[PDB]
Design an enzyme around this catalytic site. Structure first.
Site, PDB file in Angstrom:
ATOM      1  N   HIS A 167      18.551  40.329  52.064  1.00  0.00           N
ATOM      2  CA  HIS A 167      19.405  41.093  52.968  1.00  0.00           C
ATOM      3  C   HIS A 167      18.958  42.551  52.956  1.00  0.00           C
ATOM      4  O   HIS A 167      18.243  43.002  52.053  1.00  0.00           O
ATOM      5  CB  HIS A 167      20.889  40.918  52.606  1.00  0.00           C
ATOM      6  CG  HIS A 167      21.307  41.617  51.344  1.00  0.00           C
ATOM      7  ND1 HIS A 167      21.205  41.030  50.096  1.00  0.00           N
ATOM      8  CD2 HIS A 167      21.927  42.805  51.148  1.00  0.00           C
ATOM      9  CE1 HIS A 167      21.703  41.850  49.186  1.00  0.00           C
ATOM     10  NE2 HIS A 167      22.119  42.948  49.794  1.00  0.00           N
ATOM     11  N   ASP A 177      18.993  48.454  47.942  1.00  0.00           N
ATOM     12  CA  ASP A 177      18.492  48.002  46.657  1.00  0.00           C
ATOM     13  C   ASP A 177      17.622  46.753  46.758  1.00  0.00           C
ATOM     14  O   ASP A 177      17.153  46.260  45.721  1.00  0.00           O
ATOM     15  CB  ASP A 177      19.627  47.781  45.645  1.00  0.00           C
ATOM     16  CG  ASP A 177      20.752  46.917  46.147  1.00  0.00           C
ATOM     17  OD1 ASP A 177      21.084  46.939  47.352  1.00  0.00           O
ATOM     18  OD2 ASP A 177      21.357  46.258  45.267  1.00  0.00           O
ATOM     19  N   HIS A 178      17.381  46.232  47.983  1.00  0.00           N
ATOM     20  CA  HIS A 178      16.542  45.052  48.192  1.00  0.00           C
ATOM     21  C   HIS A 178      15.480  45.268  49.246  1.00  0.00           C
ATOM     22  O   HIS A 178      14.377  44.736  49.082  1.00  0.00           O
ATOM     23  CB  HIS A 178      17.403  43.818  48.520  1.00  0.00           C
ATOM     24  CG  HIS A 178      18.472  43.639  47.514  1.00  0.00           C
ATOM     25  ND1 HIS A 178      18.210  43.286  46.202  1.00  0.00           N
ATOM     26  CD2 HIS A 178      19.803  43.840  47.597  1.00  0.00           C
ATOM     27  CE1 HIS A 178      19.341  43.299  45.528  1.00  0.00           C
ATOM     28  NE2 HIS A 178      20.320  43.641  46.353  1.00  0.00           N
ATOM     29  N   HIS A 203      19.668  40.084  42.425  1.00  0.00           N
ATOM     30  CA  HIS A 203      20.012  40.620  41.118  1.00  0.00           C
ATOM     31  C   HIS A 203      19.856  39.478  40.133  1.00  0.00           C
ATOM     32  O   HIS A 203      20.584  38.477  40.243  1.00  0.00           O
ATOM     33  CB  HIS A 203      21.435  41.155  41.128  1.00  0.00           C
ATOM     34  CG  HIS A 203      21.587  42.310  42.065  1.00  0.00           C
ATOM     35  ND1 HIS A 203      21.315  43.608  41.693  1.00  0.00           N
ATOM     36  CD2 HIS A 203      21.907  42.347  43.378  1.00  0.00           C
ATOM     37  CE1 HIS A 203      21.475  44.395  42.742  1.00  0.00           C
ATOM     38  NE2 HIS A 203      21.854  43.661  43.765  1.00  0.00           N
TER      39      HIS A 203
HETATM   40  C1  LIG Z   1      27.301  43.521  43.324  1.00  0.00           C
HETATM   41  C2  LIG Z   1      25.889  44.107  43.442  1.00  0.00           C
HETATM   42  C3  LIG Z   1      24.935  43.457  42.447  1.00  0.00           C
HETATM   43  S1  LIG Z   1      25.944  45.922  43.111  1.00  0.00           S
HETATM   44  C4  LIG Z   1      24.872  46.363  44.538  1.00  0.00           C
HETATM   45  C5  LIG Z   1      25.751  47.222  45.505  1.00  0.00           C
HETATM   46  N1  LIG Z   1      25.069  47.451  46.765  1.00  0.00           N
HETATM   47  C6  LIG Z   1      25.224  46.718  47.862  1.00  0.00           C
HETATM   48  O1  LIG Z   1      25.948  45.734  47.944  1.00  0.00           O
HETATM   49  C7  LIG Z   1      26.031  48.580  44.862  1.00  0.00           C
HETATM   50  O2  LIG Z   1      25.190  49.102  44.150  1.00  0.00           O
HETATM   51  N2  LIG Z   1      27.216  49.171  45.123  1.00  0.00           N
HETATM   52  C8  LIG Z   1      27.474  50.528  44.631  1.00  0.00           C
HETATM   53  C9  LIG Z   1      28.459  50.605  43.482  1.00  0.00           C
HETATM   54  C10 LIG Z   1      29.492  49.485  43.410  1.00  0.00           C
HETATM   55  C11 LIG Z   1      30.351  49.276  44.641  1.00  0.00           C
HETATM   56  C12 LIG Z   1      29.587  49.315  45.945  1.00  0.00           C
HETATM   57  C13 LIG Z   1      28.278  48.541  45.922  1.00  0.00           C
HETATM   58  N3  LIG Z   1      24.420  45.134  45.158  1.00  0.00           N
HETATM   59  C14 LIG Z   1      25.346  44.038  44.894  1.00  0.00           C
HETATM   60  C15 LIG Z   1      24.663  42.679  45.256  1.00  0.00           C
HETATM   61  O3  LIG Z   1      23.572  42.543  45.809  1.00  0.00           O
HETATM   62  O4  LIG Z   1      25.397  41.691  44.884  1.00  0.00           O
HETATM   63 ZN   LIG Z   2      23.654  44.058  49.011  1.00  0.00          ZN
HETATM   64 ZN   LIG Z   3      22.166  44.362  45.664  1.00  0.00          ZN
END
Ligand SMILES: CC1(C)S[C@H]([C@H](NC=O)C(=O)N2CCCCCC2)N[C@H]1C(=O)O
Ligand SMILES: [Zn+2]
Ligand SMILES: [Zn+2]
Ligand SMILES: CC1(C)S[C@H]([C@H](NC=O)C(=O)N2CCCCCC2)N[C@H]1C(=O)O
Ligand SMILES: CC1(C)S[C@H]([C@H](NC=O)C(=O)N2CCCCCC2)N[C@H]1C(=O)O
Ligand SMILES: CC1(C)S[C@H]([C@H](NC=O)C(=O)N2CCCCCC2)N[C@H]1C(=O)O
Ligand SMILES: [Zn+2]
Ligand SMILES: [Zn+2]
Ligand SMILES: [Zn+2]
Ligand SMILES: [Zn+2]
Ligand SMILES: [Zn+2]
Ligand SMILES: [Zn+2]
Lengths: 266, 266, 266, 266
Positions: free
Chosen positions: A83, A87-88, A224
């Site tokens: 997606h 972070d990806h 992750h």
């Molecule tokens: C649950 C995760 C492992 S944390 C990261 C998230 N970013 C986008 O969704 C992410 O850093 N946030 C920033 C801090 C927390 C709340 C908003 C989200 N990606 C998620 C994923 O791919 O399941």
């Molecule tokens: Zn995400």
């Molecule tokens: Zn993520």
């Protein structure tokens, strides 16, 4: 008097940014990202495929690991994505500029990628990255074949509208290994019920749990690694504790049901 | 010796290009396109909405009919689409340049619109039009509100991946009229079974028949009026013979089943 | 062991983020940004024009100041830009989503805006912002007319390839005032000589000094007010010390010549 | 009663669509288009470059000629353009889908290519083609190096804003040959004086004549071969009568001056 706040960078746990050497998953599939973010290199006789790249600052490390695997920039042919969050998909634009690679993605992921993750349904402009254009739009169940490795897209909308699982068959110890790279099933801080930007969110997540539970899946990997109980730092035992697709889907659904109940109480 | 063929223009039946004066459907909803292509103007106190515009060459006629209705170019606020083929989205790029209007569409329609209908899953580059960018991406079930008229998107993938039905409530003779502008359910010349560019085509059409059959629908309209038995040239009886949403869905499904059987035999 | 660095946000001096109330420049022209970043609102009977918006986080403040001036979101018709860096075009994408406004820009500014300032010729991905699409592409010397105010584009490439000065005539104390909003002429940290990404940089800057020196210019304004000796916090004397276009161009050229000499010595 | 006109396809002289076998220009440079439209293949050890592709329907013929030259689809690395009209950039979108090739172009050509030639400054929507995205934006004088062949961009705005001459050095009979692929200098049916969409048109053409007259140019080639007196059907004498860059520029300027005088009289 009080100025507007400074822009806040998307900062992450150090382990997500900790470089690692390539870790072999199967005969032609390697983890080449960081300790806590997946970026998969699949090496074929007809060029290489990268599935995800992690955070924006990972581009040079990815290219170094490709070189260590014998993949030069011209040899990288295709980038696929779970997606289009920062972070990806973070380094995709830079990878396209520095390699021969083209991106294939579904329409939802393509539009989010083209806006660099801005105007996210849940995060707004809080988590953005350099925009990139897709070169090919894929439909659900469509296959892409590179050097005889067949990658199949399985849409699993929820975490983002364009969330996708990618499946392919590699080999290990002389035997076929059906690999399933399933997307995130989390909903971090999301409004689940009655969300005006995503009215059918709950129905989509429920269908996605069922999709993941049914994938061809001898080995599951996730963007992750902790979500599927991989430990990329554990060497020969990195995948020993990995979940099945069924267990991953069940765990995500139980967590989702608890989040729904907490949202109703909040 | 033999040159390559000349480019072939997308030519259509004359009635699709025959201008008509505005025809009132309900208190604020008018057909302003041609005899055989729908283009709906919904007039609110807070600006006007256009649903579809027909063929590329219809832009000036649409603007003339808007002027006749008291809608100047600055008053057109929003363009919505059934689907992004040349005979329905043709003049969108020109309308955006000549009016204040912004486009809202789903991700699938947005990507097809941005390539001007090129690389169509079924037509290739045979039926193209000037590309346009969407200003807002909508999700299934999302609402857009203009001057207190609420438009709801209902995805009905099949004819194109991004095919959408739009519903809203107007009034007529003092009573509410639930209008359903349902997209095409045809599959003209399509390969239905085992299509590599659209693997789940059949499943999507089947779900779309069910979606259309269940829409809130006192009055059905369709992009090609004949598909719902409208006759825009028939004056006070233009809508007299119109199908219900249930009858339209049933007819489309029977036609689709016959096409599947003919494809198996072919 | 050592992780990759965290992403670094584009942080700026507090005064660049310090909100101010609208400050009148001429009968229909107001500064509505912050103490140290220009964002000009020009109010016509036929809608409003915004020239620049400052940093990404300024969108809501700009909308508040427009409301204080009697400009609702539907009344904002056009956004023009000096250049497409984050500290001047930052909130454009958000403003487009929240208002009726369309963007007009030259091709160079349009491509940089569409990538959110990424892959900058000099900054790389160090200074980015949410991407936005232009609705109209303008050529050098082209005019755009809104409610009888005529805005003329004067290209002045250098600070960015697409750097533009915008000129128009307003009134004050019963007399015409030719306003020149001239872009930045700085080259902060740039490699000037032999730059492979901008081979004719020096020639372009030299032509741009001459362009600025010749603009119709009773009152000069600049994206960073200090560059033209404006002090937006000084009330009735905010513009008292402002430079002429000739003095601004001469000062920028002397600074540029000194930078060239320092680069040769470095 | 009278329908709106049918869409009119962009039809061209048969010779523009007449396939030819590859014709060698220098040791690594070949004409691989049609008798009357140039499409140049430059073959390096590190992949192939295509300069222009002609009309949209030429894609398969170009790929056949590349195969005959030993260039498979994965070997095509780069597409460069003279200008983004349908008769020169027509098949670019299809070539990108079917090969590994990426497009490099200036900002003006990139924006026109991305709209498939629609909203042309002079032709409107009369001459369009499938849209394509550029992968790299080049500046005036920028070089791109492929397998040790260095291509230099020389902007020569006029025929389109983004018109570009490309120069490189090949070899023939053991000696260097400086090849200049100079863009069109025609203004077919254009309003030259006081054009609101192109205010500095005349000044740009005049500068472009001077640019072309000064190019490094042992052998000149042009997008329409007749403009430089090439006859691709003449075999071993195809280039015998070719103009010098100086003669091409002088002829174009004399024609332009006559067109200006005729426009003043009209
Ligand atoms: C649950 C995760 C492992 S944390 C990261 C998230 N970013 C986008 O969704 C992410 O850093 N946030 C920033 C801090 C927390 C709340 C908003 C989200 N990606 C998620 C994923 O791919 O399941
Ligand atoms: Zn995400
Ligand atoms: Zn993520
Ligand atoms: C069945 C239609 C009423 S005919 C038109 C179609 N174009 C795109 O689909 C169209 O002209 N074709 C060209 C000639 C026939 C075969 C290819 C298709 N639109 C369809 C629709 O909206 O149901
Ligand atoms: C000279 C400025 C007033 S400072 C700002 C600059 N950003 C982009 O150019 C900017 O913050 N930098 C970050 C820190 C300094 C070095 C890199 C540049 N804008 C310039 C302008 O419009 O003249
Ligand atoms: C002068 C040309 C050789 S004729 C062709 C032109 N298309 C775009 O400019 C073209 O077919 N037109 C259609 C018919 C004539 C009038 C409008 C133009 N290209 C020109 C070029 O590259 O110099
Ligand atoms: Zn259609
Ligand atoms: Zn149709
Ligand atoms: Zn700047
Ligand atoms: Zn600045
Ligand atoms: Zn041309
Ligand atoms: Zn031409």
């Amino acid at each position: 008097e009080v100025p507007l706040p400074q822009l806040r960078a998307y900062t992450v746990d150090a382990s997500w940014l900790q470089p690692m050497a390539p870790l072999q998953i199967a005969d032609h599939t390697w983890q080449i990202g960081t300790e806590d973010l997946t970026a998969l290199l699949v090496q074929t006789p007809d060029g290489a495929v990268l599935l995800d790249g992690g955070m924006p600052q990972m581009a040079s490390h990815l290219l170094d690991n490709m070189k260590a695997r014998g993949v030069t920039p011209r040899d990288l042919r295709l980038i696929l994505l779970s997606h289009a969050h920062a972070d990806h998909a973070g380094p995709v634009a830079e990878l396209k500029r520095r390699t021969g690679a083209k991106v294939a993605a579904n329409a939802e992921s393509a539009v989010l990628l083209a806006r660099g993750g801005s105007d996210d349904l849940h995060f707004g402009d809080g988590i953005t990255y350099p925009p990139a254009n897709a070169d090919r739009i894929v439909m659900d169940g469509e296959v892409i074949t590179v050097g005889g490795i067949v990658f199949t897209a399985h849409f699993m909308a929820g975490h983002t509208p364009g969330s996708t699982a990618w499946t392919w068959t590699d080999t290990r110890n002389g035997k076929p290994v059906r690999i399933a790279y399933a997307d995130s099933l989390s909903a971090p801080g999301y409004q689940l019920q009655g969300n005006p930007r995503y009215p059918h969110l709950i129905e989509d997540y429920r269908r996605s749990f069922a999709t993941v539970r049914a994938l061809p899946c001898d080995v599951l990997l996730t963007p992750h690694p902790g979500a599927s109980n991989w430990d990329y730092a554990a060497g020969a035992r990195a995948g020993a504790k990995a979940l099945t697709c069924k267990a991953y889907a069940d765990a995500a659904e139980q967590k989702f049901d608890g989040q729904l109940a907490k949202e109703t109480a909040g």
